[model samples]
Target chain A: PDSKSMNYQLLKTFSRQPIQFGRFLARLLAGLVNTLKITRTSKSIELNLRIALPYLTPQQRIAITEKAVRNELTSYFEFLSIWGSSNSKNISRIHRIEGEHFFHEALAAKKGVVLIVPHFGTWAVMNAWCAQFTSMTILYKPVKNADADRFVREARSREQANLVPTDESGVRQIFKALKQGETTVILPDHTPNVGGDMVNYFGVPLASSNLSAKLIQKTKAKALFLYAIRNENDGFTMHIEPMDEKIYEGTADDGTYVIHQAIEQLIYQYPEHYHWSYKRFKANPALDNIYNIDPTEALKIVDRLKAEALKTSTQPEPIQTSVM
Target chain B: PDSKSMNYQLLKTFSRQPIQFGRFLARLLAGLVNTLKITRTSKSIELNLRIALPYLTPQQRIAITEKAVRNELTSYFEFLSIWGSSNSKNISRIHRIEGEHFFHEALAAKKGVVLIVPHFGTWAVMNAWCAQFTSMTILYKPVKNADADRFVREARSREQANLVPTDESGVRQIFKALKQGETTVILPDHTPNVGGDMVNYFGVPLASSNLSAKLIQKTKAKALFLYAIRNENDGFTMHIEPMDEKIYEGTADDGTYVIHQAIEQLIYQYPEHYHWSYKRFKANPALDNIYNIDPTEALKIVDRLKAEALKTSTQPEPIQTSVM
Candidate 1:
């Protein structure tokens, strides 16, 4: 709407320097601020304690919330430096399991496959590395944050991927590409726009998109799920699993439902990378029972359950107390 | 070895910059290669699908694997740019939750309170934030990556935190801190090193650390569970709920068992942040049926036992996939 149209010039400006040190610096600083903010708010715990700090003892409640802000800030900075990597050139070594066969079978199929990569491990590099041979089309959605969106697109573009939007036309493009016996990809649980239905995600209702089934039906494509996440040994690994049999029906709602369910399971397999911070269930209606709920309730229930369980057992003292 | 050590030292010399960006970069790159190499040895989905092909017919598994890999790579890059951070910040924002005077009153009796933060949400920051304003000690472990270790420590250091190591010495610190009327933080369910017992996680047996009960016994501190995590819109948030009255009995095994169980439940709260990728259940003896144990199985048995109470809609599929 501005006189400048799309600001193609500004986008181009950052493109030239590639991974500019200055941008990284800015991200780093922002990371710190973000982390500090999270340390103040986000509460990740093992007690399944709802992150809400008000549930805490006066002092304890205040402390954890503050720390969450800082942790988030640190994660932001961590990514800034590693954003536009083109190669897996700097890794440590290790023993990999029998996961290759899965990948092998996926590539050798007759119909061009619709790939589902959940939020687990280093999914981005997994895509790029695999692309070394197969030319594929991947679904892309604009991030709400202007800066973050720019950064994501640039980071993903490093691999020469055919990135398409997540709209009607975008869906058409993916279908067209796959019909050509080429590959197409999507982050199945990215949560489609509002009016999205609430599907069972991790046994709880979450706002979900119908893209998976829609694409399959239109393209008559078979599906496979892949998750290439961080390996425990400072390496990277992937799990190339076959989609559940239900995905093959190739009907509209039915196919999409199966695919969506499969993707949700994939997310369940690697909870952290499934985009936990995502308000996946926010738009859905609330429930009377804490079970089948979001992070807030999960935390609350986890603590109460643990304490109740502890009472039934013998050990009963608090663990750690001060900064000595 | 000699000169590389010197080079490493030189790199360290330059480490005056905020975060070991170089190390993080190098590790990520290394991780990328590891991902690729794994794909390669496995004949990868792309290459192999070209050979054995699929048993299901139609879809190319390799194409799916490749696409998933690409998306995963994008997610990793997105991590650098903060695609999933909006909700993460909200997790920390939870620290602001109000109400819970009953628990506070219980803690004021000087029964040392046990604060638990599960691995969901912005768990790391939860403690740092809590430490900033509360008299507490957080329980943490050193990273396998030495570089990461230093990074975590420096990022978390603050004036109020009495940071403790996760060893015998750390145990002493917890005891002393509580004796002085200080609060303590513990994230149960962290994957323990060798020599720890195996506990159930995500319903699977996992190697667990023994500490809660031992610590409670040592300090006679009252136990409470707390966590701060990212919420959807409000940034990071905190929550503090009093532990079950049973958890405060002050026994060793009982307290530890209760804390351990609670941690398991807490992990479910923020399943995404529960370090799902970690081999939490790997050490456990392989189960006869891991995925095959359908959650709906017991219901079927109940249906058979109480035919009159069974709903006509609840029936097994025409082709049951497994037998419990």
Candidate 2:
């Protein structure tokens, strides 16, 4: 804690002191406003604070309760900020994730495995912990900021934990890993670039990723979902479970549909931990940007545009902003 | 501007003068930090800025240019802050958009129409202007913020217009509107929530909406992708094109898939303007949370889970967060 920045150090000091609690509350209010209106990413943050408010003393709640929330969120971000290429010590990290048995089942299957971990708890910690048992390959889309990409890569990578980009080549790598009876991980609930799919989530249509289905089909690998949930006192519990096997039994196309259905179910299980401020179902085919257009000859352009339109319409539109 | 709040007015002034640009830069830097962390929701915002960077003047490229961006962004939030109740005006107020042929396309479709518009230029302005040509049934998702929801509903509603939530009831209303030959509007690029299907767009899987498909299946509602693109000098060019016939031609599930495809195409057209800071593909079925199982149900769950694990092992172990 002493090694952290001044702002964090101050926050930690205030958070631990009972008399200084009101300051934490004020900080939390500020966090809520930013998270709600400006960030709009933490759909549950405001509600979580509100619902938890009555249980707290007014003054105590005022000082530092919200700071805890902010701290938790900031810690998550800080974890992410410092993650990528990071490693954790086995002895220091504790977990009561009985659900790892499911992973045991997945691993015992002998075929490769696809691991889906949601944005809960310290996913990096989850990866680090999971890396002990198996070789992990995680797929990620590079951020527009190369600096950030490098930072994340460095923070999350260790001991042959391969970080693959979210592109054709990445899919190929997953296939290769599956063939070698290895493992790959992804945040399937994360929205796709605009070219992704928009489908029903919480009964609403959102931009979705098809990589789950594609990778599932490509590697003929086994898949499992896991969540590293944060506990109140700075601990975590890993929940690992299997998806619907009924759909996995089908053909490639059927498998695609089945895999998608399975993924959606996992998202529903933990709505609050899920990040909802994403334009999940963006990337409509109707926007007609260049890459979406057909490069074929003139006669085919109309057909291509129409086809492009059809294809674009199906995928999630990426949230984009450009300078004039 | 004169009637606006001091903060709002100050914001507008600062935004126009390029003072307070640090705020914009701060947001951009924050966006980059999130991007580096591989945050799903920040995907589009990071990338959009990336695309815009090369186009900006050196001064605009710095954090200082953020003033304009902040202003624009704040204005948008301000518009949404009002929840759509106060800013609406008659079509006649828009001196420049008069006689635009785009509005006529929806009106001329004669059948009930699904008008998809992107969030570039002033959508609110376009709506106000378009509303005059024909009665519109605009679709909306109830914001998680009840206050925001109130703002949205009140802001978008008009005497001759209809607002529908993204629910079963909303779908029914949209169907009803189309059945009566009214016009329906949707932000085709905005994704639906969970339980959505993953479809390919620009070669990515995204969560897609089902309402348009559901309505198209229920009624022969004419569907079209539209955008009120901002041109030089704060002017807009509305592009309204008919939906691909194939989208509305298939069976219920098939039609839904096709409708999403069609919508994706439109998103591709204006990729720059698309919303990108969304966690569009985060849903995953592989990682399951089973923290609070009754002991009795535990074994059964684990057994079922084991069987599912065995089944999925035969396929690719895709990382779940990559998919919506």
Instruction: Go through the candidates in order and give each one's C-alpha lDDT.
Output: 0.48, 0.49
Most accurate candidate by TM-score: 1
Residue B59 error, candidate 2, Å: 16
lDDT of 1 by residue, A1-324 (tens): 222212222222222221222233433433433234322223233121232222456455434333332333333433443354433531221124235565556557645677777654455546655565567888776765555566666666766679887677877887787777677777776666644554444434445676776777666666777765445444556566767767657445456567667665553343334433343434334432433446566655535544543444354542211111
Error of 1 at B101 (Å): 60
Residue B50's lDDT within candidate 2 is 34
Error of 1 at B25 (Å): 10
- Assess candidate 1 and give its lDDT: 0.48
Model 1 ranges with Cα > 4 A deviation: A1-82, A88-99, A102-104, A144-150, A260-274, A287-324, B1-324
Error of 2 at B284 (Å): 58
State the local distance difference test value for candidate 2.
0.49
